[model samples]
Target: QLTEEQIAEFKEAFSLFDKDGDGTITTKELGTVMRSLGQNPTEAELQDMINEVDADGNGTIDFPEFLTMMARKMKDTDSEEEIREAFRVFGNGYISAAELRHVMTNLGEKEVDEMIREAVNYEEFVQMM
Candidate 1:
């Protein structure tokens, strides 16, 4: 039930976690990504998290699986503000395309210089996140 834009964002986020260019994300990879984002889950919590969302029960998360999990997380919080705050972290109230490309590059996506937007406001940030 996600918008196409949201689905693409989710895919990009998945790219950040799916190390080794694999199509699935292991619990260990999830832990690493969580830590990089400043959350440190205990082993038990990490296992519980994976079990809660691993729909295929294959012990790894594919894009759709993690997408559903993230949708749940977004619904469970005041994510509008969180998304706005994240944009603020990249720039003051707006993020330029160059900065965005840099952030996306850091996430292992290929660099692109197209005109997605010269700068993104909070509304656009919400959509993008």
Candidate 2:
């Protein structure tokens, strides 16, 4: 589970990444921001990362994408715990997805026919956010 401080840090990072100030981030905006942070990303690398996380494919970053990227970068954690830590910003309790049976359901897929798959069953319900 995230401490109050960790959650607040996440909120700040999310807001900083949300360059549009419209509550969502576009691929261009994210790439530019990351680049400015001294992380060089080739066009292909940028597209791959964005395409992997951008479900809407509107070329933007949502809270979910932000979480996924950060989670994968973490080490020394059980898979489930890592995912919960990343998704702490949802402030929502549930994630649903159907097609992710062969894809990313573990990270909370979404659809009417989708199932609820928690990335980390290790964490108790309290950390669901």
Candidate 3:
């Protein structure tokens, strides 16, 4: 089971990843989002991540599937701590454009600026992973 806050967080992440807003996250969007976060996952890895949660055997991941996968993954303190540390590198509480640029070395200036335009708190950062 997930808390109300967890559910809300998952919904936000799902919407962000579902770039086309068609109610599912495709492997391409997943890969793009992953790279934006400074993680370089190969094409096969992206598909593997989707396949792990694609309950209906579909090529994409739906909200429920994503939520379920997240809930399980969040239980691992090791993974959680790693993400927490990554967030701290950006900022203690809030991540700024400059700080984001320094950490997201692989991303373009325009991409970094676009991400910084939205900004993200620790909670959102954790939820995004």
Candidate 4:
């Protein structure tokens, strides 16, 4: 989703989170960044975010993990047609509640069951999106 130059641009942004110039971002660093963004996330929230994207399992985010997290966030999940295509992958024409839960959980949604109904069609899911 990004070119070399674009990745370089992102590196600069990543450095802001890397705070100590250690080439990896701890939860402390992320917390400060979030605070700057006007988000006062709790420790569990920070841990959840880190656990979701900390690819190497080192309990911190390195450059590659940071890039992946940013790229995934920048994904165009807002497109209606795109959402339909993604839904199709979970079933035939509509997504079952169980399938929806699975996908949502994989996407780091902790309370998946709360948001889903028994079945979700393209239009219904589009509206939710």
Candidate 5:
């Protein structure tokens, strides 16, 4: 079962992908979100990812489906050092919008700024991971 902390972390991550304040995450948005997180999933892979969790056949991921995907992914584990290394790509101690923008050029400054309104410390990064 997901702890409350896990749920909250997932909720924030979902909001990051569910741009436009929509309740669901479309495939295009998923691609952008993944890239921002240092992933390079192709369009085909994005489709496959959505297909894996889009239980309603809606071709998009709602929060419940997103939660299901995260839960499944969390079944596999990475070491703390590995996660910290990934976080270091964005910032040391905490992730800033400037570093995020440097990594996510495909995103607009407004979007990046909004995403990092609060610098993400290691604890938050670990939970989201």
Candidate 6:
């Protein structure tokens, strides 16, 4: 949903956040950030994070990778309280399919999808974080 320029900007953040000199964001790097917020990732949580952000099999985070997996999550899901709620539902730092389904019920697929697209203001989310 991002215009080409906006998409480009988002990719830069993806790269900046990637931080290991790798093209992708790894569990360790991402986990370290998440842990600072008190999140302890389990295997399932790690996989969820990777699945949401890594598109390249090179085990790295890419723009499309993040778009397909987590850009939407950048929406209403990026707050400490919201994340805490998700964690409570997921009972961990990661979001497995079951948790995803539960969220879908809360928002309905259509509504949730709509909210994600509309709520993604990368600058805003970064500031919020």
> Any runs in candidate 4 off by more than 4 Å, and if so which?
31-47, 55-57, 76-129
Give the Cα lDDT of each candidate: 0.66, 0.56, 0.64, 0.64, 0.65, 0.54
- List TM-score per model, in order: 0.47, 0.41, 0.44, 0.41, 0.46, 0.34
Give the runs in model 3 whose Cα sits over 4 Å from its true position.
Answer: 31-47, 55-57, 78-129
Per-candidate RMSD vs. true structure?
7.4, 15.5, 10.7, 14.0, 10.4, 14.7
lDDT winner: 1
Score residue 65 of candidate 2 by CA lDDT.
61
Worst 10 residues of 5 by lDDT: 106-115
Residue 112, candidate 3: C-alpha displacement in angstroms? 35
- Weakest 10 consecutive residues of candidate 3 by summed lDDT: 70-79
Off by over 4 Å in 2: 1-3, 32-44, 75-129
Candidate 5, residue 92: lDDT: 46
- Candidate 6 lDDT at 32 equals 55
Question: Which ranges of candidate 1 are over 4 A from the true structure?
Answer: 32-45, 55-57, 79-129
Instruction: Tell me the tens digit of each residue's lDDT in model 5 across 47-102.
Output: 78776665365767778876776566545543487667766755247656565656
Error of 5 at 117 (Å): 34
Candidate 2 all-Cα RMSD: 15.5
Q: How many backbone clashes does candidate 5 have?
A: 0
Candidate 6 local lDDT, 3-42, one digit each (tens)? 6764665566567777666566665565554454334566
Task: State how far residue 127 of model 2 sits from its true place (Å).
Answer: 30
